[PDB]
Amino acid sequence: EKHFMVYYRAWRDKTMQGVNTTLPDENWLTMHDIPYGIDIVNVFSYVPKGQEALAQPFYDTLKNEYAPALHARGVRLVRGIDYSELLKVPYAGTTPTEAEFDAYAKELLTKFVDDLGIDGLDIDMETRPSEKDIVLSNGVIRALSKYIGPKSGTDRPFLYDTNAEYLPPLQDVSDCFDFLAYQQYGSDDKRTQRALNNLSPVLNGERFVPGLTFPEEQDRNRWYDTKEPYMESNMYKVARYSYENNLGGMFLYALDRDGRTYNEDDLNQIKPSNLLWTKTAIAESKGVSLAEMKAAAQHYLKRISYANTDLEAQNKAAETVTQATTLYDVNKAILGGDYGQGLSNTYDAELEKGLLAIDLTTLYRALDQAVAAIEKAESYTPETIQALQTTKESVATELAGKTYTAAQVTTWQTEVQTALDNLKE
Ligand SMILES: CC(=O)N[C@@H]1[C@@H](O)[C@H](O[C@@H]2O[C@H](CO[C@H]3O[C@H](CO[C@H]4O[C@H](CO)[C@@H](O)[C@H](O)[C@@H]4O)[C@@H](O)[C@H](O[C@H]4O[C@H](CO)[C@@H](O)[C@H](O)[C@@H]4O)[C@@H]3O)[C@@H](O)[C@H](O[C@H]3O[C@H](CO)[C@@H](O)[C@H](O)[C@@H]3O)[C@@H]2O)[C@@H](CO)O[C@H]1O
């Protein structure tokens, strides 16, 4: 049971503009674009004071569109809150009672979770809080565990993310979280096992999810978790270590920045991304075999060949997939190094895996006969070849889309086959 999480920077969704940035660039992705295979999304949102109205459209879309759509895909969502939030528990006396802890836990869940249609919570603790703070945080976390996390009896996640191994705020309430999200941006599996060992008294490796980042625009820090050769990048090392040592999985920060750099062009720009590194990391963490990856890649290349006019690029991609030695290479053969540089910008290995179950052989032979008829176009009547061409191009465009169903494939088979049976001469 592996997890793959992502911290979705809310202010980089299309529904936001001018929130938490000074860059006039338009955002390029929505939450619909989050790749398949990610089972936990952390709606990570920070709104500078005075911009709440600008971020409200995103929250509305999240509650009414993104969250239902991602729930339909089996994805659970969590909200990222500061650890200090837990410290704001109201109480009358010198220390909060059990009832006051419960009241503030329900308050947090209504404020940050239920009011957005989201499932769970994520506590971002990058501090060294004192014993006084930890009393309150322990009370609040234990109260929350009644409604979210393992001790709640529900599917709702309760996560604890940190970049260090300060145990005091975690040792007394460790069993209330589904897993700990360890941020190790710019570090490989050595820091991973170092932190695992330092967290051993309070956390088992199976509930330890290491995570890396992509370069954030205008960032003062410099975390290099991507690089070629792929097998020398921190992403490969951490993913393969997580799979090999049966860790809880892996997470990534700033999904929108997949494939970006700190170069002056990327540092001050918002650009689209083929999400190559994210999908590769999902596969590497899950332990996908190279045969599986190649099969999915070839299925995708076959179902887009009817709509793609670049036969040379098709041949090159197919050959590279066959000659690929790593999952990264199989994904890059289709996606390319960067957005637009590939035969496709949206190929998703997990989505394609889901599609594998649908048989396309009938549709494929029908489309091949249609292509043969279009090749001998001068030999039929135009009034009928034009029906065939319109139907074939429409079916090929639809077949190369993001997803399809068995019923749609049946309809397309019927349409192409009718168009074929109606050719004159
Ligand atoms: C999990 C993780 O990856 N954590 C951090 C990353 O956040 C951090 O990236 C940067 O994050 C800031 C946003 O961080 C602030 O808000 C976080 C989310 O909580 C907010 O919303 C909650 C719910 O409404 C509120 O309860 C909360 O108060 C807050 O408003 C919050 O978790 C975070 O707090 C952590 O860090 C502080 C110290 O800074 C610590 O005291 C806390 O205890 C806690 O651990 C912050 O309060 C985001 O604004 C940054 O993005 C800008 O800058 C980048 C360039 O760096 C631009 O690309 C981008 O366009 C924005 O202009 C950035 O994403 C990374 C380091 O970058 O480190 C991780 O560990």
Author numbering: 61 to 485
Article, verbatim:
Here we focus on EndoE, a multi-modular glycoside hydrolase secreted by Enterococcus faecalis, one of the leading causes of healthcare-associated infections. We provide X-ray crystal structures of EndoE, which show an architecture composed of four domains, including GH18 and GH20 glycoside hydrolases connected by two consecutive three α-helical bundles. We determine that the GH20 domain is an exo-β-1,2-N-acetylglucosaminidase, whereas the GH18 domain is an endo-β-1,4-N-acetylglucosaminidase that exclusively processes the central core of complex-type or high-mannose-type N-glycans. Both glycoside hydrolase domains act in a concerted manner to process diverse N-glycans on glycoproteins, including therapeutic IgG antibodies.
The Man5 product could be modelled unambiguously in the electron density map, located at the center of the (β/α)8-barrel and surrounded by the loops 1 to 8. The N2 atom of the acetamide group interacts through hydrogen bonds with the side chains of D184 and E186, whereas the O7 atom makes a hydrogen bond with the side chain of Y245. This conformation likely corresponds to a stage of the catalytic cycle of the enzyme shortly before the release of the glycan product. Supporting this notion, the crystal structure of the EndoE-GH18L-Man5 complex and docking calculations of EndoE-GH18L with Man6, Man7, and Man9 show that Man6 can bind to the active site of the GH18 domain because the additional mannose (Man (-7)) of the α(1,3) antenna can interact with loop 1 of the enzyme.
